[PDB]
Amino acid sequence: GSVQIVYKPVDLSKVTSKCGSLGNIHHKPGGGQVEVKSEKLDFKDRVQSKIGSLDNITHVPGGGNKKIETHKLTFR
Amino acid sequence: GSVQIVYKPVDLSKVTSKCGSLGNIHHKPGGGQVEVKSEKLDFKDRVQSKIGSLDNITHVPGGGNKKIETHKLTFR
Amino acid sequence: GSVQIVYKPVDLSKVTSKCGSLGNIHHKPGGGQVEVKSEKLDFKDRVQSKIGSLDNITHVPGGGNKKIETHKLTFR
Amino acid sequence: SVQIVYKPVDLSKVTSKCGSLGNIHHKPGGGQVEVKSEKLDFKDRVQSKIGSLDNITHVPGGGNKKIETHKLTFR
Amino acid sequence: SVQIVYKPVDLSKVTSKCGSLGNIHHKPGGGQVEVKSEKLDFKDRVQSKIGSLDNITHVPGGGNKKIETHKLTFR
Amino acid sequence: SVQIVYKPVDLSKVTSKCGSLGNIHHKPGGGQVEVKSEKLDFKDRVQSKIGSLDNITHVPGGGNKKIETHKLTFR
């Protein structure tokens, strides 16, 4: 027999912001004092090692708003 | 017999922000003193090691609003 | 016999912030003193290790509003 | 056969925070002022100030001294 | 046969923060001033100031001294 | 047969932050000033100032001294 599928989601979303000012953002991390002492360091497969390292991100978008949509129709 | 599926969700969502000001944000972490003493360090499969390291994020979106929708129709 | 499914949820929702000012936010963690003494450090399958390290996030959205929807229809 | 290791670590923080600093919505409000002066005689030095609001932060203090003397004498 | 290692580490932080600094929505408001002067006689030096608002940040202070002396004498 | 390793490490920070700095929405406001003068006699030096707002940042202070002296004497 007949199968009829009418997939028509309707989207009039508003995702919005107003910011009067962004400013005076100070990302100033400071490293310490670090010592590693050994007869050997022995690192093998997919070892990740950070010694006294800095990983720094400053992210300051004026909006930074997101709208994520997934639409799926599976007929089987 | 006949199967009829009508999928029409209606969406007039509002996600909104007003901010008069963002500022004076101070991300200033400080490392200490770290000592590792050994005869060996011996790291194998998928070891993750951080010694005295700083991983630092400042995220300051003026809005930062999110909307997420998943729509699924499965006919089986 | 005939099957009819009508899926039409209607959404007019409002998610909203008003803020006069965000500011004077001070993320300033300090490390101490850490000592690890050994004959060996010996790490294998998916060991995660942190000695005297800092993981630091400041997240300061002017809005930061979220809306999440899942719509699912399963015919089987 | 002597070994000497002289390795002091100074991670120290010295800080002064003086005056106003972290204030939010500070709103000092001077009222109306009126001065009416008639027939005043001054026979010596005059110093005068008139006004609605003095909003002063004055900091002759604060500020820092670090002194650290390091000496190694082997002899 | 002597070994001397002289390796002091100075990571030290010395900070002065003096005056106004991190204020948010500071709104000092001087109201109305009126001065009416009639028939005043001054027979010596006059110093006069008139005004609605003195908004002042004045810092003779703050500022820093680091003195750090390092001496190694072997002899 | 003597070994001397003189290697002091300076990573130190000396900072002065004096005056106004990181203010947000600082809005000083002087209201109306009126001065009316009649028949005033001055027989010596006059100093006068009139105005709605003085908005002064004045920093004779701040400033830094670093003095670090290194001496290695073997003899």
Describe this entry's structure for a reader.
Chains D, E, F: The record marks 7, 13, 17, 27, 36, 39, 66, 71 as: Not glycated. With 76 residues, chain A is an all-beta fold. Helix content of chain A is 0%, strand content 63%. Chain A has strands at 3-7, 10-11, 14-19, 22-27, 33-37, 40-43, 48-51, 54-59, 66-75. The radius of gyration of chain A is 26 Å and the shape is flat. Chains in contact: A-B, A-C, A-E, B-C, B-D, B-F, C-E, D-E, D-F, E-F. At the A-B interface, strand 1, strand 2, strand 3, strand 4 and strand 5 of A face strand 1, strand 2, strand 3, strand 4 and strand 5 of B. Strand 7 (48-51) of chain A pairs parallel with strand 7 (48-51) of chain B.
